């Protein structure tokens, strides 16, 4: 039996932060379920190109608005309750207008290595700057 909680996973090694998303890993390869499961926040304003050549992924949007454009296919608006699945290993752009909370399922499981690698993703547009700077720490 396995029990976890999002509020324990955030700000933790299972919460992987990138320029365009924040991925809270719920079931890992270690957990041995046959799939990985996470809760990903795609940040407002971002664009990411995505292509998983070695996995199929299901995505279920429970918050926010955006779209997914399939390279060589259609463009599908994302809203709460929309779900898409890349059974065809589709190359695609993922765009968030507001922050999107996505529940995600990978088959086979992603590994910590692939997540940290950012295997299959290419972030193209980051969120707008909050006036921050690396050499500024005031
Ligand atoms: C569609 C997507 N999957 C990744 C994941 O759930 O690991 C998060 C970033 N975006
Ligand atoms: Fe995706």
Residue numbers in the entry: 1 to 138
Paper quotes:
While the EctA and EctB enzymes have amino acid sequence-related counterparts in various biochemical pathways in microorganisms, the ectoine synthase (EctC) is considered the diagnostic enzyme for ectoine production. Crystallographic analysis of the psychrophilic S. alaskensis EctC protein [(Sa)EctC] showed that ectoine synthase is a member of the cupin superfamily. By using an ectoine synthase from the thermo-tolerant bacterium P. lautus, we were able to obtain high-resolution crystal structures of the full-length EctC enzyme in complex with its iron-cofactor, its substrate, and its product. The (Pl)EctC protein is a head-to-tail dimer where backbone interactions between two ß-sheets mediate the contacts between the monomers in the dimer assembly.
